[PDB]
Every structure is written in C-alpha cells, then in structure tokens.
Amino acid sequence: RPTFYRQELNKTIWEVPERYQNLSPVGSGAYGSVCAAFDTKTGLRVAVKKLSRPFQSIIHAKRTYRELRLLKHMKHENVIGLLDVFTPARSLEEFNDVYLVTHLMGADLNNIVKSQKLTDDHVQFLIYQILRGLKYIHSADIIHRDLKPSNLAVNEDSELKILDFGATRWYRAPEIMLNWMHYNQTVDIWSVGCIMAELLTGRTLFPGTDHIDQLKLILRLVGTPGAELLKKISSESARNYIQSLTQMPKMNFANVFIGANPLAVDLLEKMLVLDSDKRITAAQALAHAYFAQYHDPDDEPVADPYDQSLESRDLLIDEWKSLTYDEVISFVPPP
C-alpha cells in the first residue's frame, strides 16, 4: 500500500498517494470532480478524478462501475486509458471513495479555433486520430454519445485522445435529440462531422440557441428528410411538423467550406447525413482519400470485445460496490 496524504479540494477531502502532487481543480459536476496533477513516479501530467459519493445511489454505483470497467478496457493510443485507480480504504467494509487517474495531455480542442481556423493539414491529422480512436471504441460495441471538442484531449504536438469527463447540444446527432426507440454507433460519426467542420471553418457548424433551433439549423444545411428517411418516421403528425421547419431549399453545402480541400468536403458530406443508416463508418472514413498521408490499414487496431451486459443491469448498491472493489484491487498499471 502506498503512503497517502489528505488535503481539501473542491469542498471535500482528497486522500491520494504521495506520488501525486500539485493537485489543482479543473472541473466539477454532480458525479465528481477532476484535478490536474503531476505524477512524480512517472513524470507525467495527469488528471485525477474523485467520484462524488460513488455508492450513494444505484445510479451513482452503476456509473462508477461502468467508468472503471470501461477505462480498464481501453488500450489504444487515441483513447484515454487508466494509468491508476485507488482507494484509501483497506477493506470492502470501509470502501467509500474511488479515484481514477489518466493522462492529462494539456489542452482540449475547445480552445484552438477561437482566434482562427486550422489548416487542412492539421485537420487531417486531428480527425484521423479521432476516427482511429473511434474505430477502436466502436469495435468494442461502445457508443461514445457525447463527442465534442471538450472531450478531445490534445498535447502540444496535437496528439489526441478521446475521453469523456462525465454549447452542450451543438455536436449531438439529431436522433439522440428526438428520443429514437434505439440508436447506434453512427451517432458518433455525426459528432465527428460537426467537429471537423468547426476545425476547418473556425466556427460552430450548428450553433442552436435551443432544441428546436438546433434541429432547424441542421435541416437547413442537409435538407428536409427525403422519401427513404420519411418512411422511417412512424408518426404522420411528426412528419407534418417537420415539413414546417424549412421555408427555403437547402443551401450549397460547399458554401460553408470556402477554399477547403475537396476531399474534406466530400468526407463531411458523407458524415453529415441525416439518415444514420447512410453515414460513413469510422473504418470506412479511415480509408477515405482525405487521410492518404496517415492511413495504415495495419496500424488501426480494434478492441477486445467488452462485456456490456452491465449497462442494462438492475442491481443492489452493495453488489455494484463489491464489483467495483474487485476491479480496484485487481488493477495492474500499463507497462
């Protein structure tokens, strides 16, 4: 067992191994809080997440277990991975707090586009990495669901990792916003399209003021649902309502992307398709000519399959807690 020390951070006492130094809050929410830190044992800048009352409720306990399991599973250059997980507890009976440690990287994509747009060459490298990470995540039968610039961590050399800390709706696929009976991994490709567009233009693609505005903006770029897609919407009244959200024909798509690489625009047109069944997949996108400088079919690895049964489980807090404890004590750090 490492030696721990205690300090007050974000209104609670954080108790962490002495290797972790210079803890500085960077974000907080209902589910927990995150500090930037320096890991003196590895010389790495790290993020340390303390879960907020991880076993207070069934939902908190389930989310705690899910996050630990997922992070333990992810072993890919472009996906955030677990560097460490710890608890100050010495037994299950005293187990009450969980801390997760990941690479910090140093910045996110929420920053770089404020003053000016990125070069096409830069966008190639950034989106290539997002898609490479996403191919991996999707291959594990995991849907991200909240891809956005603040969930994309980048270092000074623009090496990128996808994370989920756990403006808000600007990158969301329309079907998530419209409570589709089911949706699938194609929602993340929509998000990549929105992100890529923004890097190229320096501006948010669909900056909706609210839910309906968001949908109207989307419909104005990509067009009202066509005949094939309309068949996939059950409600007559819903289809009638849709037909009111547009008053003019759709625009020339390319007008948003003046002077852009034609291959970039072609890829964007293939990502930003209203009908999710028709969107390009991560694997297909990696093979698109836009990424010729980076694509290597032998260096775009896939994930071991993931036991996702626990996402639909209805369990007692103490079961989620015991399952989580097992995962904490069995953790082995990466080489």
Ligand SMILES: CC(C)(C)c1cc(NC(=O)Nc2nccs2)n(-c2ccc(CC(=O)O)cc2)n1
């Ligand atoms: C693997 C990928 C990107 C999908 C991913 C990464 C993370 N987590 C993560 O990045 N944590 C970090 N800590 C510190 C720095 S980055 N989650 C995630 C999984 C589960 C839940 C719980 C819920 O579902 O609410 C929350 C987040 N998913």
Ligand SMILES: CCCCCCCCO[C@@H]1O[C@H](CO)[C@@H](O)[C@H](O)[C@H]1O
């Ligand atoms: C804004 C009003 C129109 C929104 C239409 C979004 C259609 C999204 O695409 C739909 O995704 C569903 C979930 O994966 C699939 O079941 C459907 O087959 C697919 O057409």
Ligand SMILES: CCCCCCCCO[C@@H]1O[C@H](CO)[C@@H](O)[C@H](O)[C@H]1O
């Ligand atoms: C643009 C705002 C108006 C949106 C109207 C379309 C709402 C689509 O409604 C959706 O249709 C799906 C397919 O039938 C169902 O599976 C979803 O449960 C339903 O929410």
